[PDB]
């Protein structure tokens, strides 16, 4: 969803502060008949304060929408203040307020950061500094990339000298849980950004092949491998293309870190090679199944 599904600006104290939405304001807006002209304008149930613009109607699970988010749950507010603390840590301009709020993000990445910030054993719980950084990134407002120390989370099912492997817990999620029940996915963050020895690299690869032999080793182009089962590489291919599709829109500095050919599954390396290098849909797609 867009950042504007969760909060709304407020030019107060001579700059912009972000206030979270009352799940009932939203709920009120969802029943409103509004003018075509204000569909992108912040809604006002008079009872429950401000709501998001009624265009984000489908991003919210309703009676006739199972495809959106569960905005009524405790999880909702938690995420919303998460985002709110982060944005308010930036001082955002009139210039940016629109793209910042229209910024398409991962609910699920954010819910996992909630779960991290809150469990006392995690440093996130203790270092606010670190928390912000993890949020700013998942929100796409930092130069930096996801290291292990700043990772979305889940259960570490393997830890290395230069990797940490997370099991993604998306079935049990509360704000926007994975509705498919087969689902199994892991991601592998790099402990640091630095160069990685053949000892470490081979170890990781040894792990991946004994333990997770049934899994495709892929990447979405940031600093880390998602570890998907072989039946998903498909949906994964199309999605990764579409975001490189919006290169036809500069400011999306499309640094596709096609990581170490040693870990990345060979066909993904083939596929990603073509696309990152200007090729069309089909000469890319064909590399993947050959």
Q: Which of 236, 254, 233, 255 is nearest to 245 (CA)?
A: 254
Any binding-site annotation on 263? no
- Three-class secondary structure of residue 219 per DSSP: strand
Q: Which residues contact 3 (CB under 8 A, 6 or more apart)?
A: 83, 87, 100, 101, 102, 103, 105, 139
Based on the domain organization, do 238 and 112 belong to the same domain? no
| DSSP structure class, residue 58 | G
Q: Which residues contact 96 (CB under 8 A, 6 or more apart)?
A: none
- Three-class secondary structure of residue 157 per DSSP: strand
Which experimental technique did the depositors report for determining this structure? X-ray
Based on the domain organization, do 184 and 270 belong to the same domain? yes
Based on the domain organization, do 180 and 63 belong to the same domain? no
| Cβ count within 10 A of residue 28 | 18
Any binding-site annotation on 154? no
Based on the domain organization, do 246 and 112 belong to the same domain? no
Q: Residue 209: give the domain boundaries.
A: 148-290
Any binding-site annotation on 103? no
Based on the domain organization, do 179 and 100 belong to the same domain? no
Q: Which of 282, 145, 150, 275 is nearest to 223 (CA)?
A: 145
Q: What is the CATH number of the domain that holds 238?
A: 3.30.428.20
DSSP alpha helix (H) spans, the chain? 23-29, 74-89, 97-102, 107-118, 123-126, 128-138, 198-210, 233-245, 266-275, 281-289
Any binding-site annotation on 27? no
At which of 94, 119, 147 does a domain end? 147
| DSSP structure class, residue 168 | P
Any binding-site annotation on 173? no
Q: How many Cα atoms sit within 13 Å of 165 on the Cβ side?
A: 18
Based on the domain organization, do 167 and 136 belong to the same domain? no
Any binding-site annotation on 221? yes
Is 224 annotated in the active site? yes
Based on the domain organization, do 73 and 164 belong to the same domain? no
Domain count, the chain: 2
Whether the CB-CB separation of 199 and 250 falls below 8 Å is answered with: no
Based on the domain organization, do 200 and 189 belong to the same domain? yes
- Single out the catalytic residue among 10, 126, 173, 224: 224
Any binding-site annotation on 106? yes
Distance of CA 182 to the CA centre of its chain: 21
Give the tokens for residue 152. 């979305």
Q: Which of 149, 135, 3 is nearest to 82 (CA)?
A: 135
The torsion angles phi and psi of 51, rounded to 5 degrees, stand at -125, 170
Based on the domain organization, do 88 and 193 belong to the same domain? no
Q: Which residues contact 219 (CB under 8 A, 6 or more apart)?
A: 225, 226, 257, 258, 259, 264, 268, 272
| DSSP structure class, residue 246 | T
């Amino acid at each position: 969803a867009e950042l504007a599904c969760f909060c709304y600006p407020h030019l107060e104290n001579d700059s912009y502060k972000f206030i979270p939405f009352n799940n009932l304001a939203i709920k009120a807006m969802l029943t409103a008949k509004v003018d075509k002209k204000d569909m992108d304008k912040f809604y006002d149930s008079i009872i429950y304060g401000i709501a998001p613009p009624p265009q984000f109607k489908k991003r919210y699970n309703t009676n006739d929408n199972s495809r959106g988010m569960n905005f009524e749950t405790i999880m909702f507010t938690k995420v919303a203040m998460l985002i709110c603390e982060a944005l308010n840590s930036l001082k955002v301009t009139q210039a940016n307020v629109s793209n910042v709020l229209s910024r398409v993000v991962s609910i699920r990445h954010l819910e996992n950061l909630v779960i991290r910030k809150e469990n006392p054993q995690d440093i996130l719980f203790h270092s606010k500094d670190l928390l912000l950084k993890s949020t700013l990134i998942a929100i796409g407002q930092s130069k930096e990339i996801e290291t292990t120390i700043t990772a979305e989370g889940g259960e570490i099912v393997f830890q290395n000298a230069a990797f940490t492997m997370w099991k993604l817990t998306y079935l049990e999620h509360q704000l926007m849980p994975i509705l498919d029940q087969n689902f199994i996915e892991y991601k592998v963050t790099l402990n640091e950004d630095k160069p990685i020895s053949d000892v470490h690299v081979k170890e990781l690869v040894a792990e991946l092949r004994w333990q997770y032999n049934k899994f495709a080793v892929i990447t979405h182009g940031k600093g880390h491998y998602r570890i998907v089962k072989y039946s998903s590489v498909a949906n994964h291919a199309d999605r990764v293309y579409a975001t490189f599709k919006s290169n036809v829109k500069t400011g999306v500095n499309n640094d596709f870190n096609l990581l170490d050919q040693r870990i990345i599954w060979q066909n993904w390396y083939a596929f990603t090679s073509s696309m990152k290098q200007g090729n069309t849909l089909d000469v890319c797609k064909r590399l993947l199944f050959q």
